[PDB]
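Hi,

I'm pasting everything inline rather than attaching a file, because the server keeps stripping attachments. The sequence lines come first, and each chain or strand is labelled.
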Amino acid sequence: INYYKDSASNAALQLTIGNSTITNSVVAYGRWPEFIRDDEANDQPTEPDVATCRFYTLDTVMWGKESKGWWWKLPDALRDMGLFGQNMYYHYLGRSGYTVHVQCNASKFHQGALGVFAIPEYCLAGDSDKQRYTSYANANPGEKGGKFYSQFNRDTAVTSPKREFCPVDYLLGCGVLLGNAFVYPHQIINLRTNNSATIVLPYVNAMAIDSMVKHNNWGIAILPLSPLDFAQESSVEIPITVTIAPMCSEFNGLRNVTAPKFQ
Amino acid sequence: INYYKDSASNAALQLTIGNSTITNSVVAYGRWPEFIRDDEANDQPTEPDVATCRFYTLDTVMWGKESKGWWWKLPDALRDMGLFGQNMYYHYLGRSGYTVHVQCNASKFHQGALGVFAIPEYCLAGDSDKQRYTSYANANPGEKGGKFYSQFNRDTAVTSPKREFCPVDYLLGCGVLLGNAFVYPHQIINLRTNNSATIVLPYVNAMAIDSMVKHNNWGIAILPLSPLDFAQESSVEIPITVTIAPMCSEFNGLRNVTAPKFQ
Amino acid sequence: FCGSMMATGKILVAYAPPGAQPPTSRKEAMLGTHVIWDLGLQSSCTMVVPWISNVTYRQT
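And the predicted assembly:
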């Protein structure tokens, strides 16, 4: 029998989106993106349908024998993509899901394997003795993204510290073994079987809607699980491309435009 | 009896919009703004609801004894107003109606009268012997607008012609007597009775949807019908303010952004 | 595409409505109506340009 009143006291193929078309997919946590429901809110939202929910292509990168990996942050990577960025900077609160498509083509005589991982609340480690001293500009590279490293290079500057991340490939840049990174939503591109990967990411956060400028909801990490090789050539390089499509995006809190200082 | 097959041969208070609020109105041609109907079109349109349909306030002007009038062009005046301008420049085709509110307050000891006229396809005359030689930059001043004159000042420059309009107050800048300008939708602000004017303009054009950059659908003309005076003071000046709210706006033809060269 | 069966690649074909500067880079082109074509899987690609115009008819 419970005595106290409070409960706490109780003892215990082609995909077309908007005006864009790309020619199996993985759905994160088995949850498709959806709009906010009437039983959860905090004014009239602004919900663009086709002016923002479309595929945007990022800058192509090059994969060689010495490449260690790449990473991007969302919605940071799309801050300068058409009207999506304008709505992001003109509103205090934003929400959206994503569709990520990774393209990399090779021949039958090439070999290699890429692992793509989608990580919620992807926090990276610094490059100095000081803790949590990374700057906003360095933590939001944009569409260019960042790269991984095979060793921890401590910053020796004392007058003008860099205040940058120092990810480590085999620690996933956060102090966890890479082998377990498959616990996150993931895809594998093996050159002998396939040449592309697709993932669908719903909106994940402790709040229904949150600011897009000061908080990044998703991180994308691409790492070479097996080194690239071709016949018996000494040097090999192939392009890797990334495309991202926002889905079911909502904005609220219209006011003057935000102008962050990126360097 | 008709012989030929072809028919041609046949013988013959507070108003709230979006996040804006203003505290009788005139509806042009008795037609409220409305969206395009399914029985008239030419892709998926983009129809912002609250991010663009709201009141924007232009720069205040000053009315004195020697003032002759002012004029503005729409949608030209709103080309740099929030997301409305971004959608205008990111789309090939646009459509919208307008709500115009003119504010001017004075005392009981002042006297004067302002006439506000909304003109469809408002074409102005040049200032040179050459015909239709006005430049794009001079024909689209923006939110600053233009002013009227009491006489025609021919441009004497032969090397670097100005290529500007020369409106005449009593000819309405188009060769028609001002007295008949009341045939257009109009309002009168008399300082002894009222202090504000409101007009609602639907979309008017020979086509259902048309480009907003190279064509202006409406013109607004404000002229002093009676001179301003106050007691027996030699100089009198009072402010006049204009606010405009887009209504039922549609856009189509998404592509890269247009960047017109304004000087 | 009339290459060899061992050739692979990807192409982007874009249409841009009038009004802005003609595209000169992939970043500008992708903002329009674009299709991505995979040579290896398909040797032929088709893109439909839909009708979008202010006037009901265009001059020839």
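The interface with chain A takes residues 19, 43-44, 46, 48-51, 82-83, 86-87, 90, 251, 254 of chain B (CB under 8 Å).

If the labels don't parse on your end, tell me and I'll reformat.
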